[PDB]
Amino acid sequence: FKRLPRHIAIIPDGNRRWALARGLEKHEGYSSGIIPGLEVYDICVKIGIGEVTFFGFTQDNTKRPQIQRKAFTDACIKSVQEIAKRDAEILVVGNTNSDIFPEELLEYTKRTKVGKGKIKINFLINYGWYWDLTYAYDNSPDGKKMIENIASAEIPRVDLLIRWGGRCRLSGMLPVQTVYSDIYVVDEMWPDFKPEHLFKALEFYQNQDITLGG
Amino acid sequence: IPKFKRLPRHIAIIPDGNRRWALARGLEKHEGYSSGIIPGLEVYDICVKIGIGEVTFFGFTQDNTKRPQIQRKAFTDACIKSVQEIAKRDAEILVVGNTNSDIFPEELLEYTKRTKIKINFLINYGWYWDLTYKMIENIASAEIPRVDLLIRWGGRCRLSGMLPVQTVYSDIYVVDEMWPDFKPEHLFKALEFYQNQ
Ligand SMILES: CCCCCCCCCCCCCCCC(=O)O
Ligand SMILES: C=C(C)CCOP(=O)(O)OP(=O)(O)O
């Protein structure tokens, strides 16, 4: 590739529809979401992508049935643990002042180098856009302070956002970082991840006309 | 005009593609914007006809003002004309953007409080200006409600810093044709996409 995004955001959606289409229960797709994340990680390391942010689950996601919440929470926990067994600088962002936040992930709420490091991997866990923006409007000297102090301030601008499951929407992922993100939608559900999904998203990105500005 | 089961309460419009449209016709980059005015009129007419409650037009942003002077005059004049032409019609008009600047057209200052379908224009708007303006109720764009469907002409799939608060859950529909090549079926196809969610 001629041009590569510095930072890729991943919305690994489609897990419940994927399960249903296979004659499984809605809650049973999320565990088939783990290996795909691993492949996105391996391809990203291989091409030398600097940063990937995975949309794990939101505060909004937690109003779902308990059976689904346990399943997507456990799949998020396992994904982080599995990337932690690899070569990554891991960070987890989300509301830690809540029962819903998995204790297992508290040790990743400050960027943690694992193995040989290099690539930055972020997870949004018990994340919410409103929580993110208001975090700053606690006790900030000024407006110029607020944006530097959003809960996600450590996560830089997203160049390319890739969403599985055929919906073209952000679902409140990082409103500040996504203002100029090029958005690529994969029609396949996340558990049907294929490398060509990512290769096609990267071609889309490199095909953008850079004369056109923001 | 087809009939629809579901309709968005609020549609955002990013009328992009004006410069590429001009270039493909052998015109100068700045010379497409004026061909953007009638399309806005047609989106307004179709929206009134189906009884869409609110439409927000992306006019121009603080970022857009770092483009050449020849382009800035041309998009600023086309925005001014578009507001004036919707004002000649049956509409509750609001203009949001940074009025504390030379760049903000004096002609539009009278529309920076709602008059009397609701039609909003972003004029010298900036996402950073918007948020740094309790907080969430007091963003510069607080009057503009959540966007249900955002339609962008000119083939790019991105928000270009349009209303980060209101667009968090917006379904986004991209028309490949440039804005001056607007066709009614662009909007109809966007509305079918919306109802099929
Ligand atoms: C106000 C609606 C019709 C106006 C007619 C055309 C002039 C408006 C300017 C077009 C550019 C707006 C979108 C640019 C998006 C971007 O910055 O990438
Ligand atoms: C990652 C999340 C939150 C799911 C994305 O879909 P939405 O969040 O837009 O889904 P609904 O609001 O329609 O449930």
Numbering used by the authors:
A (entry chain A): 6 to 219
B (entry chain B): 3 to 118, 124 to 140, 150 to 213
Copy the relevant paper text:
MM_0014 from the methanogenic archaeon Methanosarcina mazei is known as a versatile cis-prenyltransferase that accepts both isopentenyl pyrophosphate and dimethylallyl pyrophosphate as acceptor substrates. Cis-prenyltransferase (cPT) generally catalyzes the consecutive head-to-tail condensation of isoprene units and produces (Z,E-mixed)-polyprenyl pyrophosphates. MA1831 and MM_0014, which are orthologous cPTs from the methanogenic archaea Methanosarcina acetivorans and Methanosarcina mazei, respectively, unusually accept both IPP and DMAPP as prenyl acceptor substrates.
The crystals of substrate-free MM_0014 were soaked with either IPP or DMAPP to obtain its substrate-complex structures. When soaked with IPP overnight, an electron density consistent with an IPP molecule was observed in subunit A, but not in subunit B where fatty acid was still bound. IPP was bound to the cavity opening of subunit A, which remained in an open conformation and bound an inorganic phosphate molecule. Superposition of the two subunits of the IPP-binding structure (designated as “free+IPP”) showed that a fatty acid ligand overlapped IPP and therefore might inhibit the binding of the substrate to subunit B. It is also curious that no electron density derived from a Mg2+ ion was observed even though the crystallization buffer contained Mg2+. Superposition of the structures showed that the C4 of IPP, which is the atom involved in the C-C bond formation in the head-to-tail condensation, nearly overlaps the C2 of DMAPP. In fact, the position of IPP seems unsuitable for the reaction. Because of the absence of a Mg2+ ion, the pyrophosphate group of IPP is misaligned by ∼3 Å from that of DMAPP.
